[PDB]
């Protein structure tokens, strides 16, 4: 038979593609969700019968776009806010009478250019570095030698709001529905959505908070489980509740820097001074560690599983950072990772609070969070872990893992692992017996 080319339009095919995604959200937050497109009141999802597709969470560029959007939104929120450049001034400090706080005094500018005022304030020792004169009485803010410091606006909330990511028409997002999935390899159950489920921005360095839970079993994900350089993401079946407190009752005072500006600081503490801390229930955490170890043994030859604290590096690396009440906490997680698991009350984690932060580790940038008055309490769920393998060892007896990861993108991957962006190509051609009639 003589076959002829026939053109079809609306053909159900796609190819992998990278396209600009835009935010959507449920109908002043730092993420500017008011700018986002309202979500559909009844979101659609279409199961694709007989479709098997390859996913790779480590090559996923939705992650790169999310990271750029998170940084860009953060920066936009600081543009109208008060600069603290005038505060880089010699500080004179004494003990508050704990070691974590110093009572500092300094000369600061006023609404009038020719006038000056003396300001008394309390600072966390982490935000304070000694001046090279080394008299022990003179100090400066820690980032004055590396960056301008901008005060976050007190009106701007840092609370996470779920953000749905949507793709342009003519593009679609595939979702993996398999009961367990490594984020790599072939997914048997695939469905199509215009937008992702809402994903909360969460900033953390060792533990993943308030993320998605595994349906049945703990899922361990890595680009290469045998390569110690790679960061291992562990998703938990059940959450472990972590609760945090800042026992100090801070009294917040405000002093004008200049016209249109104000500086917020803790001027006094009511009651005794106590170290901030977070607790994890011991029995629930222990069950979690055992289950993680049981899963790790399936990749590592049933070697004894050892957990250990980070070997070193910056506070941002060695401790668990998070935003609680608008305050930035850094907690010592060695209480969580001290166990050894053979094949055969609560845990209290000390914490520190730092007002000057560099969340994206960018040179030349810094933010000063204003203090939040009164006692601060938070509650969140540990939903996953960031682990690294301690390599360089040939031991066949046991294996060692430590908390933490190389990048913030590792957090975004924990929610986006199941999503893939594809371009829809409605045209196609195929042979038929059909021939066009000509006038």
């Amino acid at each position: 038979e003589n076959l002829w080319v026939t053109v079809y339009y609306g053909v159900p095919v796609w190819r992998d593609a990278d396209t600009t995604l835009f935010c959507a959200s449920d109908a002043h937050n730092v993420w500017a969700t008011h700018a986002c497109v309202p979500t559909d009141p009844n979101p659609q999802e279409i199961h694709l019968d007989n479709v098997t597709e390859k996913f790779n969470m480590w090559k996923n560029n939705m992650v790169e776009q999310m990271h750029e959007d998170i940084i860009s939104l953060w920066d936009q929120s600081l543009k109208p806010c008060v600069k603290l450049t005038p505060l880089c001034v010699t500080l004179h400090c004494t003990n508050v009478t704990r070691e974590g706080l110093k009572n500092c005094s300094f000369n600061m500018t006023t609404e009038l250019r020719d006038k000056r005022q003396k300001v008394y304030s309390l600072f966390y020792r982490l935000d304070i570095v000694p001046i090279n004169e080394n008299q022990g009485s003179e100090y400066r803010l820690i980032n004055c030698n590396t960056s301008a410091i901008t005060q976050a606006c007190p009106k701007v909330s840092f609370e996470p709001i779920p953000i749905h990511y949507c793709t342009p028409a003519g593009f679609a997002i595939l979702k993996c529905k398999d009961e367990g999935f490594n984020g790599t390899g072939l997914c048997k159950n695939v469905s199509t959505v215009q937008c992702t489920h809402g994903i909360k921005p969460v900033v953390s360095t060792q533990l993943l908070l308030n993320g998605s839970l595994a349906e049945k079993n703990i899922i361990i994900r890595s680009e290469n489980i045998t390569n110690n350089a790679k960061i291992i993401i562990v998703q938990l079946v059940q959450p472990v509740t972590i609760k945090c407190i800042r026992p100090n009752n801070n009294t917040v005072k405000s002093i004008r820097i200049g016209p249109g500006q104000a500086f917020y600081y803790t001027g006094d503490i009511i009651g005794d001074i106590r170290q901030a801390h977070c607790n994890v229930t011991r029995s629930r955490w222990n069950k979690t560690l055992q289950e993680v170890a049981e899963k790790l043994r399936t990749y590592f030859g049933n070697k004894t599983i050892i957990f250990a604290q980070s070997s070193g590096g910056d506070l941002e690396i060695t401790t668990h950072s998070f935003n609680c009440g608008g305050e930035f906490f850094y907690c010592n997680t060695s209480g969580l990772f001290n166990s050894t698991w053979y094949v055969n009350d609560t845990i209290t984690l000390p914490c520190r609070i730092k007002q000057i932060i560099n969340m994206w580790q960018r040179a030349g940038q810094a933010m000063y969070a204003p203090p939040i008055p009164g006692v601060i309490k938070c509650e969140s769920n540990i939903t996953g872990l960031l682990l690294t393998r301690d390599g360089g060892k040939d031991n066949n007896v046991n294996e060692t893992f430590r908390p933490g990861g190389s990048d913030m993108r590792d957090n975004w991957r924990s929610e986006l692992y199941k999503y893939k962006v594809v371009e829809i190509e409605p045209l196609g051609v195929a042979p038929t017996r059909c021939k066009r009639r000509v006038v």
Binding site: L21, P168, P426, V429, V438
Partner: protein, 116 residues
Amino acid sequence: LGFLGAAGSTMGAASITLTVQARQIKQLQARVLAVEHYLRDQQLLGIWGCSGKLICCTNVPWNSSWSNKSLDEIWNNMTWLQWDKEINNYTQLIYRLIEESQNQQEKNEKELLELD
């Protein structure tokens, strides 16, 4: 079914759903891109004389080098996803041949009307 619900179905079975897929600062960029995407394919249909049609037969003969498969082997034994991969290296060649054939047809119909 639903959007792309036919993607795993055979090429013949999938044809019943063509209309399902025929329909359908960063937000502004998304909107402009969606328009460019849509028009790219509509432009080809307009050139091919296939505008306004979901299925459009042409005068271009099938070249067996593109595929030696029988019609049953294509229509009752393949998904469109598999088919696109098989002829991915010939798709642009086919497109040009359709365009050449349409232009000759447009010319021939003009000449017919000139005679009549």
